[PDB]
Amino acid sequence: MGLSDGEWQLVLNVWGKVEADVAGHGQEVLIRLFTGHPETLEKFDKFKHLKTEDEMKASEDLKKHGNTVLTALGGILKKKGHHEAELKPLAQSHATKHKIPIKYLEFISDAIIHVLQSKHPGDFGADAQGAMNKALELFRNDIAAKYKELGFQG
Numbered sequence: 001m002g003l004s005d006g007e008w009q010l011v012l013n014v015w016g017k018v019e020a021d022v023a024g025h026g027q028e029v030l031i032r033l034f035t036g037h038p039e040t041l042e043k044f045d046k047f048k049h050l051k052t053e054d055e056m057k058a059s060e061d062l063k064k065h066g067n068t069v070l071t072a073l074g075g076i077l078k079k080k081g082h083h084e085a086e087l088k089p090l091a092q093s094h095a096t097k098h099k100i101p102i103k104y105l106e107f108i109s110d111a112i113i114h115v116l117q118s119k120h121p122g123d124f125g126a127d128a129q130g131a132m133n134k135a136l137e138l139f140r141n142d143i144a145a146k147y148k149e150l151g152f153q154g
């Protein structure tokens with residue numbers, strides 16, 4: 001499940017593109033998640049009512065939350081397989097009040113690979129897509145281990 005140094009280099013390289021506009025990337029990721037998987041939308045009190053891509057873009061809160069999501073994920077990814085320190089608070093909040101199924105983690109991960117493909121193809125070739133998919137599977141897997149401790153499944 002671990003990533004090779006090469007795979008980590010592929011991940012960090014593309015994250016460099018996200019670094020320039022974390023909020024804007026986060027916005028596009030959530031929009032991709034919400035449009036492809038509308039049931040995910042139901043887990044956000046604030047966004048449950050945004051029916052359209054224009055409405056989602058018009059939401060300042062959605063963009064700000066997008067920033068929040070990718071800022072955290074950025075933290076995890078730059079730690080490269082020594083990341084459980086930032087995972088605990090993430091697992092804790094996605095498995096208690098919220099209750100976010102692992103499969104929704106998969107979906108946002110797909111949304112992430114999709115946005116990076118579209119926006120940064122020259123920095124996201126096959127191996128890099130492979131490596132990011134791995135980094136993100138590792139992340140879900142680790143969170144899912146913490147979900148059990150937190151007593152979450154359903």
Ligand code: HEM
Pocket residue numbers: 040041043044045046065068069070072073089090093094098100104105108
């Ligand atoms: C890479 C995946 C994700 C990351 C890094 C992430 C990160 C975060 C962070 C940092 C917060 C705010 C503080 C906290 O609660 O820990 C948060 C809150 C939240 N997360 Fe996530 N999240 C991810 C995936 C998801 C998904 C897929 C969903 C639901 C479909 C979700 C649902 C929520 C909700 C509903 C909140 C509170 C929203 C609010 O009050 O605005 N998260 N998440």
